[PDB]
Design a binder for this molecule. Structure first.
Ligand SMILES: CCCCCCCCCCCCCCCCCC(=O)OC[C@H](COP(=O)([O-])OCC(O)COP(=O)([O-])OC[C@@H](COC(=O)CCCCCCCCCCCCCCCCC)OC(=O)CCCCCCCCCCCCCCCCC)OC(=O)CCCCCCCCCCCCCCCCC
Lengths: 231, 59, 49, 29, 365, 31, 54, 54
């Protein structure tokens, strides 16, 4: 499609794609004991254990509001690890960061836990909303199954199993029913099904170039005055 | 045809789970290209509507 | 659209160009960014701000 | 071109229709 | 034989978009040294169909220029590559011009071919003298009914499997699935049987093309992206009065939007008087449409193509002086004044005409 | 029975062998 | 010239294009991930025929 | 409406278009006059061969 044409896009004064130690005039320089009288520094060697305790708190303090949902605790754990594995797998050389990446990430995670302790972190609220929307749909299926009724998801699974038999019952010259064929059969069913639903307009433009919004009503004028409520 | 090489059942269940892993990924990429069909011209959507297509960015 | 409206283009890149200078290591940009706004109305008189 | 017309008729030159319908609404969404 | 010379080769699937070579027919001109014209046919359409148009004594186009009826990538005999980026397909032409030792050429196209021709002038203008587009416009046509049908037919063609399907099964498929007579005939003649009758296939890459059209995004051939930019040179547009592809109402504005030198209707943009007929897209078939296209083409090649922008016609070469911008020349002791711009030989790079005439000039003095 | 009954059995073994990269796997393919 | 404001337009005009080509750019990234996925599914197609081969 | 001024534009636009096709319309008028002229010249080509036939 389109690729960045500038070959020097990732160049910095410090090197190629360097976002760990940008070049600045006041660069780090060494210190010599025999000549150093006093010093004021905030660096220390406590980040490793603070990285550990921070993980335990963020996990244990967020589980307070999961109500024993084991599947959510396990899903949240996978998401929590993705937040702590950022420095271990990033392109950025987190080991060469300016003034210590270890202290930087730890202090950054602490600001997240502060919000987690109050149950105000956006990832928490995002989790509650996403889960409630999920359980409502699983309960809708349960109520339909207890009534002996068939779910919309099973009607497709059953409608797709038969469509495969019809295709392989005529596919006798060959006998390699690829995953590609299996896929485009389902998509042909999904498009037909989705179009059947009364969904809000998602694409800007319909079959014509014109937009599918309620505002795309141009001339000619054929609508009369609006009518009132009926008694 | 009834049963054979209970040791063979080791890879029958290994390759079956291995395939289920990469079938889940195939469905991820397949479903994304399916939803991507209704999304066209990011420059024609409002700001708060684009974030809704890419749910999670606002969070 | 932040890519067609020159009003948000100018303000967005201008702010990004100001905060990226935190790598100059003056001090906490969260502290002195408010003083920059005041200093702008001192020397911005030349530009009628 | 850089000479598109008068200021009053400026919003006229934007519409590009996919059909042969006349007259054409000028507003470009 | 002589006038008709089409280089012969086999398509090669290429992983790199730069190692793509174009192949097509070359029509030699009546006269020894003439500038060259590169013409792109409609998508999935045969180059041979345009031969009687460019080899008609009544029109006498070859008297003006040598014609290269060239196939774009994934079409005809040219190499194959999934990308249809007009910038990539434009670089292909520049390599062809280099391999064939063409310094600069006149570009033409029919329908989607016109887009490809105009794109080359947008990306490589210093080596393009002019563009002549026929029933096309630099516009997004994804939602035009005519394009949808073409987009729809190509998708139906993906259902046929030549290995299993018999010759009769194909003919029945086309008649029912393809209603347009011309498209039907075009697709039939694109079917070819490889050596040793291994199997029959389409001359154009059906897979790469359908994905481009079916996806229906910016890289689609129906789309014209802002990335393509502006064409700085001479451009003439000719399309039928009632055309499904270019509607006179609004589809002329893209020409002004993309072509800087386009003056407007009646000077660089014309419509051919005709009736409503879905087959009017194929002007070369109907004499009435063709006679007008040819006359306008010969006028563009004779008087307007390869002429400096600020000059009206070729008549003004050597007698009209263009104003100069101050501080535009390196010489400091230069008295700025009006000048006649330099018009160079069409293949001055790969010949020594300038070196030769310099010697003859000295002999005079 | 004699002719053409082993063609498919050769395609399967061939692919299984082509996928083998380590020497250990190649040995099992020979067996 | 003081081209600072122009540099901000050129980048925005370039991003305007990257957004217009989002569908194509992403679809090409998946064409390689799907290739990797299809390659791993070849091991299951081989095992399903062992019972018939045997 | 009082479309008098519009009628003057429409007539000018049609004349402007005819001037744009002056070359095509006059060339078509001569193709018939040349066909008539060529038809009368067919007689001189016949008499030139009488000596060869005789
Ligand atoms: C380390 C800091 C140094 C500070 C020096 C102090 C200030 C000196 C002022 C001199 C006046 C001209 C200034 C030119 C620089 C303009 C840069 C600029 O404005 O930013 C654009 C810049 C990006 O825009 P750009 O267009 O891409 O920049 C390139 C230029 O446009 C054009 O690109 P370019 O490649 O063509 O030029 C590169 C640039 C490189 O600049 C440098 O590298 C600085 C080098 C040290 C200073 C050298 C020049 C000092 C002045 C000499 C004056 C000579 C007078 C002789 C008088 C003789 C007659 C008696 O300029 C020069 O090369 C200067 C060379 C001077 C040659 C003179 C030739 C002979 C002229 C003789 C005629 C005399 C007439 C005098 C009349 C009065 C003046 C009109 O923005 C930034 O990069 C932001 C970072 C800012 C850097 C630090 C601050 C520096 C000051 C900039 C203004 C403040 C910025 C923040 C504003 C906040 C608003 C929200």
């Amino acid at each position: 499609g389109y690729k960045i044409r500038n070959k020097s896009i990732f160049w910095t004064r410090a090197g190629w794609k360097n976002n760990w130690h940008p070049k600045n005039f006041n660069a780090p320089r060494p210190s010599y004991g025999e000549f150093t009288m006093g010093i004021r520094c905030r660096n220390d060697h406590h980040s490793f254990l603070r990285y550990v305790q921070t993980y335990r708190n963020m996990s244990r303090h967020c589980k307070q509001y999961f109500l024993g949902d084991k599947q959510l605790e396990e899903t949240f754990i996978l998401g929590l690890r993705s937040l702590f594995l950022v420095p271990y797998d990033s392109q950025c050389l987190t080991d060469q960061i300016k003034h210590g990446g270890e202290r930087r990430f730890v202090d950054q995670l602490d600001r997240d836990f502060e919000l987690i302790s109050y149950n105000t972190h956006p990832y928490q609220l995002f989790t509650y909303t996403v889960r409630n929307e999920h359980l409502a749909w699983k309960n809708e299926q349960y109520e339909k199954i207890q009534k002996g009724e068939k779910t919309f998801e099973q009607e497709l699974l059953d409608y797709l199993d038969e469509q495969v038999l019809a295709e392989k019952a005529k596919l006798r010259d060959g006998q390699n029913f690829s995953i590609e064929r299996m896929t485009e059969i389902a998509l042909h069913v999904f498009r037909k099904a989705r179009a059947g639903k009364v969904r809000p307009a998602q694409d800007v433009r319909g079959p014509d170039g014109n937009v599918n919004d309620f505002l795309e009503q141009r001339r000619p004028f054929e609508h009369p005055n609006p009518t009132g409520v009926t008694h | 045809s009834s049963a054979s090489s209970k040791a063979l059942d080791d890879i029958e269940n290994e390759l079956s789970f291995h395939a289920a892993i990469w079938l889940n990924a195939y469905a991820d990429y397949t479903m994304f290209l399916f939803e991507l069909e209704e999304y066209n011209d990011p420059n024609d959507y409002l700001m708060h509507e684009n974030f809704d297509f890419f749910r999670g960015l606002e969070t | 659209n932040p890519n067609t409206e020159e009003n948000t283009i100018d303000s967005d890149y201008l702010a990004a160009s100001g905060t990226v200078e935190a790598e100059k290591e003056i001090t906490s940009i969260d502290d002195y960014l408010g003083l920059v706004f005041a200093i702008a109305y001192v020397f911005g008189v030349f530009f009628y701000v | 071109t850089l000479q598109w017309g008068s200021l009053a008729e400026r919003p006229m030159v934007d519409r590009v229709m996919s059909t042969s319908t006349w007259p054409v609404p000028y507003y470009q969404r | 034989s002589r006038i008709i010379n089409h280089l012969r080769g086999d398509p090669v699937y290429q992983d790199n978009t730069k190692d793509v070579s174009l192949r097509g027919t070359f029509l030699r001109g009546k006269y020894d040294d003439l500038p060259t014209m590169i013409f792109f046919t409609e998508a999935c359409d045969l180059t041979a169909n345009w031969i009687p148009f460019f080899t008609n004594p009544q029109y006498d186009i070859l008297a003006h220029r040598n014609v290269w009826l060239l196939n774009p990538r994934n079409f005809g005999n040219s190499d194959r590559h999934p990308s249809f980026d007009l910038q990539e397909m434009s670089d292909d032409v520049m390599r062809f011009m280099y391999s064939q030792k063409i310094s600069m050429a006149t570009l033409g196209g029919h329908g989607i071919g016109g887009k490809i021709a105009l794109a080359v002038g947008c990306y490589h203008a210093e080596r393009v003298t002019g563009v002549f587009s026929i029933d096309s416009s630099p516009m997004d046509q994804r939602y035009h009914e005519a394009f949808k049908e073409f987009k729809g037919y190509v998708n139906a063609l993906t259902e046929i499997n030549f290995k299993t399907w018999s010759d009769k099964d194909v003919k029945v498929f086309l008649k029912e699935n393809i209603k347009d007579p011309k498209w039907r005939s075009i697709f039939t003649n694109n079917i070819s049987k490889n050596a040793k009758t291994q199997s029959d296939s389409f001359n154009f890459e059906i897979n790469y093309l359908n994905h481009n059209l079916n996806f229906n995004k910016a890289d689609s051939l129906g789309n014209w992206a802002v990335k393509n930019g502006i064409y700085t040179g001479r451009a003439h547009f000719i399309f039928p009065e009632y055309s499904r592809w270019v509607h006179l109402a609004t589809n002329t504005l893209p020409m002004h939007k993309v072509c800087a030198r386009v003056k407007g209707f009646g000077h660089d943009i014309f419509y051919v008087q005709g009736d409503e007929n879905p087959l009017n897209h194929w002007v070369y078939d109907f004499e009435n449409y063709a006679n007008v296209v040819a006359s306008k083409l010969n006028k563009f090649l004779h008087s307007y193509d390869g002429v400096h922008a600020l000059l009206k016609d070729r008549t003004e070469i050597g007698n009209f002086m263009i104003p100069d911008r101050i501080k535009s020349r390196n010489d400091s002791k230069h008295i700025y004044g009006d000048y006649s711009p330099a018009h160079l030989h069409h293949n001055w790079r790969f010949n020594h005409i300038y070196e030769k005439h310099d010697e003859l000039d000295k002999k005079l003095n | 029975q004699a002719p053409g009954n082993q063609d498919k059995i050769l395609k399967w073994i061939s692919t299984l062998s082509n996928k083998a990269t380590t020497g250990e796997s190649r040995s099992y393919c020979t067996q | 010239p003081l081209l600072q404001r122009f540099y901000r337009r050129a980048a925005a005009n370039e991003i305007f294009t990257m957004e217009a080509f989002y569908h194509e750019n992403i679809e090409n990234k998946l064409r390689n991930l799907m290739r990797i996925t299809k390659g791993q599914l070849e091991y299951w197609d081989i095992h399903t025929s062992y019972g018939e081969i045997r």
